[PDB]
């Protein structure tokens, strides 16, 4: 029964990616201080308790499922697609989400606003004509007042519908004040859609769409994610726990229920 660890995660034989100040979800969305994670890959993504968000305030309904899905895929490989957004203003940014000296936004999302005095009913389509599954990440903006709503989107109530042949999500923006985060009471909510080969992403909105820019490639394989503050070290160990790498030569272990790699069974 293996009962101790070194307190460090050995960087072989698995590709360990240290999140440093970034959650996987922030790396996914493209929070600017996470830009260095663009198109990264891992066998194990390590999330640290120092991680913090530094972009527009957001939530993710069913956060844990998206985090798991992405973690298991083992890649942030992103392919930009030729989405056409007729009659709207693209690339909205924020002083809450600085990239370089200037206001910015999540790299993988496209904040659409009115053009002139109009925001039309957007109706766009993106077929999956590839032989793999595509993951799309998108959102909805929740203004804090009616005046913000009509200033940005014209319509007094927006709506975002994203569908494939297999399913449909219709999100209704919720106008109102949330708790203050760094001087803002507005939020974005994040949602996702998987598009299988031969299916088609359909997006329909008359306001408040935070649009996708393209898709993330989905793989199935051995990859995962772990919450741990253990430092990474230069050594070899097959079995990793949040407490650190452990030898796997004994058949049982009581260091942690959470393990990555070929490990001893937990007790």
């Amino acid at each position, epitope marked *: 029964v293996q009962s101790s660890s070194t307190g460090k995660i050995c960087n072989n034989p698995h590709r360990i990616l240290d999140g440093i100040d970034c959650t996987l979800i922030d790396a996914l969305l493209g929070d600017p201080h996470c830009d260095v994670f663009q198109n990264e890959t891992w066998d194990l993504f390590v999330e640290r308790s120092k991680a913090f968000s530094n972009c527009y305030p957001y939530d993710v309904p069913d956060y844990a499922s998206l985090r798991s899905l992405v973690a298991s895929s083992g890649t942030l490989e992103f392919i930009t697609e030729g989405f056409t957004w007729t009659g709207v203003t693209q690339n*909205g940014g924020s002083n809450a989400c600085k990239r370089g000296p200037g206001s910015g936004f999540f790299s993988r999302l496209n904040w659409l606003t009115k053009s002139g005095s109009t925001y039309p009913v957007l109706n766009v389509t993106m077929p999956n004509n590839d032989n793999f599954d595509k993951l799309y990440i998108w959102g909805v903006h929740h203004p804090s007042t009616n005046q913000e709503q009509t200033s940005l989107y014209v319509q007094a109530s927006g709506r975002v519908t994203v569908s494939t042949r297999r399913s449909q999500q219709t999100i209704i923006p919720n106008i109102g004040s949330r708790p203050w985060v760094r001087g803002l009471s*507005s939020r974005i909510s994040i949602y996702w859609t998987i598009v299988k080969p031969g299916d088609v992403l359909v997006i329909n909105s008359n306001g408040n769409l935070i649009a996708p820019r393209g898709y993330f490639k989905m793989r199935t394989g051995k990859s995962s994610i772990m919450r741990s503050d253990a430092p990474i070290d230069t050594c070899i160990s097959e079995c990793i726990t949040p407490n650190g790498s452990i030898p796997n030569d004994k058949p049982f272990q009581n260091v942690n229920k959470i393990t990555y790699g070929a490990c001893p069974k937990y007790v």
Partner: antibody, heavy 137, light 108 residues
Framework: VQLQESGGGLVQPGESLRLSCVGS?????????????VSWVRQAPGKGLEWLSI????????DYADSVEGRFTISRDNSKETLYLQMTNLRVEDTGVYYC??????????????????????????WGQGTMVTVSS | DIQLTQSPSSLSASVGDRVTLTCQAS??????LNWYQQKPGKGPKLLIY???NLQRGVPSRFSGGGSGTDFTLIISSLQPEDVGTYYC?????????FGGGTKVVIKR
């Protein structure tokens, strides 16, 4: 939205002068001057219009005409819905009526945390009445 | 810099006449072209934005057209209050520039 310039008057060649432009009222939303990019434009006596300088809603993407670059500085204080033009090293040929002119496209919604990515710099849909600047000995 | 040249330099026409003002740009400015009316000793007022859009509150006798290098402002039925100077203005590129103006006078 309405605009009113002030600060114009007589100055000697080589002196400085600071002009102000104050926004009051409302537009789409119930928008104030701080939603918008603004330029200064002048008109010499009997002559046409000369664009001088632009400033985006949030204070950035500043540019100047070559005639005034290095001498004039545009700035704004959105808490007072006020624009400024700080002029230095003034010359006789700077003499004219100075207008504040608001560009039409919404460039930010203050309090929302949204700013438009690009400075559009489109049509001047509101102009002030203008303030006269005379540079003479 | 982009130069705009207006024609004619001035004109007189009778109340009710159809009046055509032109603006030529020294290079292709697409439709990044606006028209203003200035009455003497007053600020300019926007008439037409982006070559052909009539500003809200402007009488429908004003219309604009063109793209690229050649633009027109048409007053379909000239009225006594239309006297003043009319300027075109481009924002395709910095510095933003104005034409030299066309002065409109009523022949009575």
């Amino acid at each position: 939205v309405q605009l009113q310039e002030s600060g114009g008057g007589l100055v000697q060649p080589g002196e400085s002068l600071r002009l102000s432009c104050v926004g009051s009222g409302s537009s789409f939303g119930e928008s104030t001057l701080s939603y918008y990019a603004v330029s200064w434009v002048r008109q010499a006596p009997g002559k046409g219009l000369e664009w001088l300088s632009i400033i985006n809603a949030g204070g950035g993407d500043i540019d100047y005409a070559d005639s005034v670059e290095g001498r004039f500085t545009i700035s704004r204080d959105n808490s007072k819905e006020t624009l400024y033009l700080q002029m230095t090293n003034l010359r006789v040929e700077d003499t004219g009526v100075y207008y504040c002119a608001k560009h039409m496209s919404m460039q930010q919604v203050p309090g929302s945390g949204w700013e438009r990515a690009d400075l559009v710099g489109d049509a001047f849909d509101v102009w002030g009445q203008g303030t006269m600047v005379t540079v003479s000995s | 810099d982009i130069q705009l040249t207006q024609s004619p330099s001035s004109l007189s026409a009778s109340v009710g006449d159809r009046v055509t003002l032109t603006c030529q740009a020294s290079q292709d400015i697409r439709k990044f072209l606006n028209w203003y009316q200035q009455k003497p000793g007053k600020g300019p007022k926007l008439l037409i934005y982006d070559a052909s859009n009539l500003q809200r509150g402007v009488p429908s006798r004003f219309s604009g057209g063109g793209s690229g290098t050649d633009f027109t402002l048409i007053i379909s039925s000239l009225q006594p209050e239309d006297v003043g100077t009319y300027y075109c203005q481009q924002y395709d590129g910095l510095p933003f520039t104005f034409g030299g103006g066309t002065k409109v006078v009523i022949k009575r």
